[PDB]
């Protein structure tokens, strides 16, 4: 219980600063489609 | 140039939608029923009986 603990804390942790840079995550992706 | 930049601008804010929603959990199926609940009608059953 302990260890599923611990990997819902680092999954939700990881998730959060994910979600913080998505909408600069996909703008990028979009530019390095976009770029000539 | 200033316009061209500015519309370079609203280019990427048009292509990068993600907004206001979004959707966290896609749907799934309970595979339980919620109806009927079988033990709570034999019960009533019983008791009116």
Avoid: W
């Amino acid at each position: 219980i302990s260890h599923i603990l611990d990997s819902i804390s680092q999954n939700y942790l990881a998730q959060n600063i994910a979600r913080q840079a998505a909408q600069d995550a996909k703008s990028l992706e979009f530019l390095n489609q976009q770029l000539p | 140039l200033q316009l061209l930049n500015r519309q370079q601008e609203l280019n990427i804010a048009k292509s990068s939608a993600i907004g206001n929603v979004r959707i966290i959990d896609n749907a799934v199926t309970d595979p339980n029923p919620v109806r009927p609940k079988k033990t709570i009608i034999i019960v009533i059953g019983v008791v009116l009986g």
